[PDB]
Amino acid sequence: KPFTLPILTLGELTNSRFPLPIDVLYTNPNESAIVQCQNGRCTLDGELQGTTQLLPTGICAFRGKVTQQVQDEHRGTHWNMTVTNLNGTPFDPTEDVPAPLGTPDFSGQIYGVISQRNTNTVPGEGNLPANRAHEAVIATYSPKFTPKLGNIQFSTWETQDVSSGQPTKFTPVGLASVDANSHFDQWTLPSYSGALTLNMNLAPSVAPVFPGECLLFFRSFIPLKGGYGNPAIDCLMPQEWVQHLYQESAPSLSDVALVRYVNPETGRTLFEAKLHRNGFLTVARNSAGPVVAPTNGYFRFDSWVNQFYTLAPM
């Protein structure tokens, strides 16, 4: 079965690491961190890895139940919630995954909305349940962030109106802050089972091997609740590529696919890239920053090549 990529353009792609559209292609050759994100991880023959799942609505989402308000040194009102799988089934910590699929894969203060729909109903209210929603923050670097253990903590501005024991949804929206105390680092993984524990079942780190090459990312700018900043989240492949590869399950005929970024209006190749078996792109570029190209551009699979292939410089 022939390997293919979707023919979605850049303006028709979304980030696999946060629910955002792709804004630009981006490189950063001098990156010192190990790149080992856990969402947006899929091999070219369709094997999902890390915490990657298929739903755009599941990325950095949680489902579960609030148990109780809990004490925390930091500003706000804090709440513990058990978390299930996104489909509502109990999370089984013995599954070979780092954490429930969809769990955030970076250090930071994730801002979103917690909403609840009660299980019990009121006969006087048409046998309909009570609801509430409030803004919430999840500090993924907190020692109380333990999604692999089945529970996490979030904070609210709201001091009282979060109910215990009721079905709870977290809808991510952006970051609370990128100030010095907010520990935003997109390449630092959370400790999924808590402080001082080793993460397990990780999707592998990715890196260029060939001289002169660097990773190419699909970059999205992420909203902020407050403060100064222009934070971004870079994914290895957009969510639509995860979904496509998973569907197709095309055998990988070598370790490296040659892809061409094409202008469909003109037919011209803007640049070429290596698409590696584990699901990431490299290019021959010696600079950091956006790739300035039209958003109607798209990657086209050309052929299977190998580690010895020399890319034309961007």
Ligand X SMILES: C[C@@H]1O[C@H](O)[C@@H](O)[C@H](O)[C@@H]1O
Distance CA 152, CA 160 (A): 18
Candidates 214-222, 225-233, 278-286, 292-300; binding stretch for ligand X (CB under 6 A): 225-233
Confirm or reject binding of residue 132 to ligand X (CB under 6 A).
Answer: yes
Q: Which of residues 23-52 bind ligand X (CB under 6 A)?
A: none
List the single partner that 11 binds among a second copy, ligand X, none, CB under 5 to 8 Å by kind: a second copy
List the single partner that 7 binds among a second copy, ligand X, none, CB under 5 to 8 Å by kind: a second copy
Confirm or reject binding of residue 122 to ligand X (CB under 6 A).
Answer: no
Q: How far is the CB of 4 from a second copy (least distance, A)?
A: 10
Q: Tell me, residue by residue from 139 to 158, as one string, x for binding to ligand X by CB under 6 A and - for no binding.
A: ------------------xx
Calculate ∠ Cα 61-4-235, nearest 5°: 35
User: Quick one: which of 228, 265, 266, 308 contacts ligand X (CB under 6 A)?
Assistant: 228
In which residue are the tokens 């403060």 written? 227
User: Quick one: which of 130, 195, 200, 209 contacts ligand X (CB under 6 A)?
Assistant: 130
List the single partner that 157 binds among ligand X, a second copy, none, CB under 5 to 8 Å by kind: ligand X
* 109 alpha carbon, distance to own chain's centre: 14
Q: How far is the CB of 212 from a second copy (least distance, A)?
A: 31
Distance CA 147, CA 160 (A): 24
Contact footprint for a second copy (CB under 8 A): 6-8, 11-14, 19-21, 54-58, 86-87, 111, 113, 115, 117, 122, 125-126, 128-133, 135, 169, 171, 173-174, 221, 223-230, 239-240, 243, 247, 295
Tokens representing 284?
């021959």
Tokens representing 4?
């293919």
Confirm or reject binding of residue 264 to ligand X (CB under 6 A).
Answer: no
Distance CA 159, CA 172 (A): 20
User: Quick one: which of 31, 45, 135, 240 contacts ligand X (CB under 6 A)?
Assistant: 135
Query: C-alpha distances in angstroms, 69 versus 64, 164, 165?
Result: 15, 8, 11
Picking from 174, 175, 147, the residue whose alpha carbon sits closest to that of residue 80 is 147
Q: Sign (positive/negative) of CA torsion 229, 224, 158, 57?
A: negative
**Residue 246 per-residue DSSP state:** H
List the single partner that 224 binds among a second copy, ligand X, none, CB under 5 to 8 Å by kind: a second copy
Q: How far is the CB of 252 from a second copy (least distance, A)?
A: 19
Query: C-alpha distances in angstroms, 36 versus 87, 106, 116, 123, 235?
Result: 26, 10, 33, 51, 10
Distance CA 271, CA 173 (A): 33
Q: How far is the CB of 155 from a second copy (least distance, A)?
A: 15
In the complex with ligand X, the residue whose CB is nearer, 133 or 270, is 133
Tokens representing 71?
């004490």
User: Quick one: which of 90, 143, 204, 227 contacts ligand X (CB under 6 A)?
Assistant: 227
Query: Is the distance from CB of 246 to CB of 46 less than 8 angstroms?
Result: yes
Binding residues for ligand X (CB under 6 A):
130-132, 134-135, 157-158, 161, 226-228
